Amino acid sequence: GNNVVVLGTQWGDEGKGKIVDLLTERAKYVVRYQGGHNAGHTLVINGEKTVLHLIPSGILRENVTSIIGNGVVLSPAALMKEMKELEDRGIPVRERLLLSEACPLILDYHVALDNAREKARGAKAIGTTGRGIGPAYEDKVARRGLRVGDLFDKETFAEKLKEVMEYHNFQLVNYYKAEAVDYQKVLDDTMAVADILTSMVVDVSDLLDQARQRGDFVMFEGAQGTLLDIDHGTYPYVTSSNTTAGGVATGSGLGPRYVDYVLGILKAYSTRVGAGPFPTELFDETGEFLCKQGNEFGATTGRRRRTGWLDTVAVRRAVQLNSLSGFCLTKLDVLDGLKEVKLCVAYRMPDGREVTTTPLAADDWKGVEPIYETMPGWSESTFGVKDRSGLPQAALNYIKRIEELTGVPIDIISTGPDRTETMILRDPFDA
Amino acid sequence: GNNVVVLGTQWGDEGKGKIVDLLTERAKYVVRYQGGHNAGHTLVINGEKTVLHLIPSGILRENVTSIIGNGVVLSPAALMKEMKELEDRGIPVRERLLLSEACPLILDYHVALDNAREKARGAKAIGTTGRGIGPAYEDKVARRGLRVGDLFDKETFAEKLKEVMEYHNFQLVNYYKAEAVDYQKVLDDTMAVADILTSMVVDVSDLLDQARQRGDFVMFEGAQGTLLDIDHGTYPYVTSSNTTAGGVATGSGLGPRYVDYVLGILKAYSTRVGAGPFPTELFDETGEFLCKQGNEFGATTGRRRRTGWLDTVAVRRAVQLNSLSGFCLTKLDVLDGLKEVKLCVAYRMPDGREVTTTPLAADDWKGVEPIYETMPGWSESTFGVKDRSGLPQAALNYIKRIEELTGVPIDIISTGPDRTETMILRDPFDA
Ligand SMILES: Nc1ncnc2c1ncn2[C@@H]1O[C@H](COP(=O)(O)O)[C@@H](O)[C@H]1O
Ligand SMILES: Nc1ncnc2c1ncn2[C@@H]1O[C@H](COP(=O)(O)O)[C@@H](O)[C@H]1O
């Protein structure tokens, strides 16, 4: 293990932040490779809780350097605010954060377009986090968007900005019948922050090629989760970047032959935020329980999380897309006390077919019914348990069964939100 | 070597088709993972020449099955026409081609938008192949585009199509002041072809996971070339998909840990079609010669290829982005007879700095001057040479030097356009 990737196996919310922090004790670098300032990675260190959206989760560690790869659509505003919070708390953010000059820039008109498209989708709305992420990526593949490097030339910057905003404001005002966005506002706002950004630029592909030669340990930190991947997820209820392990190469520039171990963060039950298929969703007292003990309330309106049983058919898809090496089970404790726990092992098709493979497009997920395997729960607390011996036999069997159905071993078990409450059965760095 | 990727190291036109055909003698599968019907992969078998744009280059082989992965933006029209040509020639295309239901569909309004945006860019035009590739990808990341799977429900299909065309025709007619696109035309055209498409659908990620278990040999066929990659290329003079090896995972669904060998196709001199930086471009009699002996005239207007000396600084960037394993030198014969051959080994920056690393954004490539290494040419013919011994010492030294500067070995040497005229020093499948 030299290059270890950390990604979510489901639809997000599996607890990726804690595991990154925890493991970066040994890493020289942590790299974000996709998404935007919509991560929501929570860190609970000896009591204090930090929530990071853009800046990588290795930022609290002293020996590590954090980088934001070219796949990340970056917002100067969000970056500034997150830098301020961390500096206020005493974290010398400026001495250990580096970024790629190829990062697309997210700006006002993007959030504006994001709201616009959602409002317009009506009942077929996606459930976007509202941060203008989708539109920013859209600009990029269309080769019309700006990038951090564009900020080297203040003069040319203005010209480009002007041509872009002209096009967008048109669709806003004329098609969405929405407010236009002030050019001078954006321009001035960006210029103000412009010099903190460029001061931090670095050639990531080259830096990562060097680390590979020096034999440094590198940790990549994915956000969102596998089934929200733009290509392989439950399209269109999906995010606009590749969340799967392939996005590591594409979004940081490290050759695909150098990924050594891929850790899939697996929540003990399922969740989803926003619209979209969800075969094992619960609507009863158990659904209620998981939400409450899981503390799945959310950020704001519409950001309260949907809950359900673990879906072994969907996790199995995640296994192949990412060539997972091991899982990290999080929140087993939320299941504590239930009479019996369940887990989907196959899907019953509308026509009676029983399959073990997930459908591709949301429309095909429409009438699938989960086929469960029921097993006894456990009465004792598993929260904070630091040793395997302290886990009830019924809890161990649930674990054993996930390993059997998926073919992948559970290498780490998180028993609490604190860095200390964890069982590392196998260090990815030592594999 | 179980999983071998074949991609272009430069700006395209390196001769990828021949090498795919050649090597698929042993492969069970060949997979396209990006781009559209704009490949232009030429196959010269015992005299007959085939040019394929969409269908993979393993289509002429009897034992192989060709697949078009989810990364490929697909056009039913182009697919139909290419299927007809091949069937006419006697190739049973329908028995060995499979596609992914996640492939975005390119349709009329896309080509229409492509022309529109180019016409509008004026002097900063990109040089698009005009096939509506960029707009199709744009629709996809914005989650508004259609996919082959959408064709399962003829009813819903119409609804979606209608909502999409409504939005696009608006920007066309109202913003680009261009012709609107006929909804019923598109609709009927697609419905006609609709049943040949769905009959060929397959779950590629699952099929590739299976091949991995059976130990089958798989060949992935990239189109375009490394420096045209949307993320790491010379943006915006670039294509809209990832051409680098990372696009294999993202565009076919094979886990990144399963890529076994990456073959970089290296043309002995450089070329580029369309706008964009090009440090070693030639404007003299040599430029003229390379174009003429190389037969770099092209497809149509604007499709005549620019020529220049081999750029070892740019190739070195390709090496890291793709974790290349070996190169395949093509067209050494075009250099035959020149007095002396050159090769860029560093770049002189505007400010006098000498670097060995390529700049990222086109604007930074602006004032770079190549720093060459000159060496003697060779008078004898190398065309058709099947054995290393038959290569002049001066030609061997040119080869040796590419290996020294890049760190990667040249495993195959193509000495002619026919499958037979090749020197395989190391089979990727046996590595
Ligand atoms: N951090 C996240 N956790 C869970 N789902 C997310 C997250 N951010 C984005 N998504 C989901 O991805 C979809 C589109 O979001 P966006 O990335 O804002 O376009 C919605 O289903 C979002 O809820
Ligand atoms: N097969 C190809 N060979 C060379 N360059 C290509 C090829 N197809 C696309 N490009 C270039 O990619 C840019 C955008 O093309 P497009 O893929 O049509 O958007 C232009 O520089 C094209 O010349």
Resolution of this deposited model, Å: 2.5
CA distance A228 to A35: 11
Chain A residues inside the 8 Å CB shell of B231: 70-71, 102, 250-251, 253
Q: Tokens for A149, please give them.
A: 């490097």
Structure tokens at B325: 């394993």
Please list, in sequence order, all residues whose beta carbon lies within 8 angstroms of the beta carbon of residue A277, skipping any fewer than 6 positions away: A234, A237, A359, A362, A365, A366, A368
B150 to chain A, closest Cα gap in Å: 8
Task: Count CB neighbours of A299 within 10 A.
Answer: 14
Tokens 């019996």 locate to A340
Report the distance separating Cα A151 and Cα A155, nearest Å: 9
B38, B139, B265, B305: which to mutate for ligand 2, most atoms within 8 A of CB? B38
Q: Which helix (H) or strand (E) holds B344?
A: strand B340-348
Q: Note whether B320 contacts A126, CB cutoff 8 Å.
A: no
Which tokens in the block code for residue B358? 């390529």
Tell me if B275 is assigned to a ligand binding site. no
Nearest ligand by distance to the CA of B227: 2
Measured CA distances, B13 to B89, B210, B306 (Å): 25, 33, 11
Q: Are A310 and A343 in contact (CB under 8 A)?
A: yes
**In this complex, do A238 and B143 lie within 8 Å of one another by their Cβ atoms?**
yes
Residues A309/A280, Cβ–Cβ less than 8 Å: yes
- Which residue is closest in CA terms to ligand 1's atom 7? A224
The residue of chain A nearest to residue B125, with distances taken between CA atoms, is A143
Question: What does the alpha-carbon distance between residue A69 and residue A73 come to, in Å, rounded to a whole number?
Answer: 9
- What whole-number distance in Å separates Cα of residue B410 and Cα of residue B416? 16
User: Nearest Cβ partner of B102 from A231, A325, A357?
Assistant: A231
Residue B117 CA to chain centroid, in angstroms? 22
The active-site residue, picked from A21, A37, A41, A418, is: A41
Q: Are A142 and B138 in contact (CB under 8 A)?
A: yes
Within 8 A of A166 by CB-CB distance, chain B residues are none
- DSSP H or E stretch at residue B117: helix B108-121
- CA B291-B293-B297 angle, 5° bins: 45
In 3D, which of A184, A142, A195, A177 has the Cα closest to residue A161? A184
Torsion angles phi and psi, residue A373, rounded to 5: -125, 125
Q: How far is CA B59 from the centre of its chain?
A: 17
CATH fold of B1-100+201-265 reads Adenylosuccinate Synthetase; Chain A, domain 1 (3.40.440)
User: Residue B240, annotated ligand binder?
Assistant: no
- Residue B402 CA to residue B15 CA, distance in Å, equals 18
Distance from CA of B49 to the nearest CA of A (A): 34
Q: Domain A266-431 is classified in which CATH homologous superfamily?
A: Adenylosuccinate Synthetase, subunit A, domain 3 (3.90.170.10)
Contacts of residue A242 in chain B, CB cutoff 8 Å? 250
CA-angle at A317, arms to A314 and A322, nearest 5°: 130
Q: Bridge partners of B409?
A: none
Q: Is residue B216 flagged as an active site residue?
A: no
Per the CB < 8 Å rule, is A150 touching B249?
no
CA distance A171 to A152: 29
End-to-end CA distance of chain A: 5
- Is A13 considered catalytic here? yes
Nearest CA in chain B to A176: B167
Structure token digits, residue B368: 């770079």
Q: Do A360 and B149 touch (CB under 8 A)?
A: yes
Q: B133-141 and A133-141 are packed helices; what angle lies between their axes, rounded to 10 degrees? A: 170
Non-local CB neighbours of A66 within 8 Å, separated by 6+ positions: A29, A30, A31, A32, A55, A56, A58, A59, A96, A97, A98
- Residue identified by tokens 């990659």 is B229
Q: How far apart are CA A134 and CA B331, in angstroms?
A: 43
**Other beta carbons within 10 Å of A362:** 17
From chain A, the residues in CB contact with B205 under 8 A are 232, 317, 320-321
Closest CA to B181 of B116, B110, B113, B109: B109
* CB B190 within 8 Å of CB B110: no
Sequence spans of domains, chain A = 1-100+201-265, 101-200, 266-431
Integer Cα distance of B1 and B427 in angstroms: 9
- The answer to whether residues A128 and A302 touch, using CB atoms and an 8 Å cutoff, is no
Nearest to A320 by CA among B211, B147, B429: B211
Q: Which of B284, B268, B93, B320 is nearest to B196 (CA)?
A: B93
C-alpha–C-alpha distance, residues B32 and A96, integer Å: 40
Say how many Å lie between the CA of residue A128 and the centre of ligand 1.
6
A416 marked ligand binding residue: yes
d(C-alpha B382, C-alpha B151), whole Å = 51
Nearest chain A residue to B357 by CA distance is A206
Question: Which ligand is nearest to the Cα of residue A235, counting in written order?
Answer: 1
Testing ligand 1's pocket by substitution, the residue of A13, A16, A38 carrying the most ligand atoms inside 8 A of its CB is A38
Tell me the CA–centroid distance for residue A223 and ligand 1, in Å: 9
Ligand 1 pocket check for A243: Cβ under 6 Å:
no
| Three-class secondary structure assignment of chain A | CCEEEEEECCCCCCCHHHHHHHHCCCCCEEEECCCCCCCCEEEEECCEEEEECCCCCCCCCCCCEEEECCCCCECHHHHHHHHHHHHHCCCCHHHCEEEECCCEECCHHHHHHHHHHHHHHHHHCCCCCCCCHHHHHHHHHCCCCCEHHHHHCHHHHHHHHHHHHHHHHHHHHHHHCCCCCCHHHHHHHHHHHHHHHHHCEECHHHHHHHHHHHCCCEEEECCCCHHHCCCCCCCCCCCCCCCCCHHHHHHHCCCHHHCCEEEEEEECCEEECCCCCCCCECCCHHHHHHHHHHCCCCCCCCCCCEEECEEHHHHHHHHHHHCCCEEEEECHHHHCCCCEEEEEEEEECCCCCEECCCCCCHHHHCCCEEEEEEEECCCCCCCCCCCHHHCCHHHHHHHHHHHHHHCCCEEEEECCCECCCEEECCCHHHC
Supply B69's token pair.
């992965």
Distance CA B431, CA B422 (A): 18
User: What residues are in contact with ligand 2 under a 6 Å CB criterion?
Assistant: B 12-13, 38-40, 126-129, 131, 133-134, 223-224, 228, 237, 239-240, 273-274
Fold of the domain built from segment(s) B101-200:
Adenylosuccinate Synthetase, subunit A; domain 2 (1.10.300)
Residue in B74, B63, B64, B62 with CA at minimum distance from that of residue B33: B74
The two tokens of residue A318 are 């995640």
Interatomic CA distance for residues A94 and A140, integer angstroms: 27
Report the 10 Å Cβ neighbour count for A349.
Answer: 14
d(CA A93, CA A83): 6
Pairing state between β B310-311 and B326-330: unpaired
Decide: A278 in ligand 1 pocket, CB within 6 A. no
For residue B180, the CA-to-ligand 1 centroid distance in Å is: 34
Chain B residue with minimum CA distance to A240: B141
Could you tell me if the CB of A5 is within 6 A of ligand 1?
Answer: no
Q: Are strands B48-52 and B41-45 parallel, antiparallel or unpaired?
A: antiparallel
Per-residue HEC secondary structure of B211-238 comes to HHHHCCCEEEECCCCHHHCCCCCCCCCC
- Chain B environment of A321 (Cβ under 8 Å): 205, 249, 253, 255
Question: What residue in A sits closest to B139 (Cα-Cα)?
Answer: A138
**Angle B177-B181-B184 from CA coordinates, rounded to 5°:** 155
Which residue in B245, B251, B364 is closest to A255 by CB distance?
Answer: B245
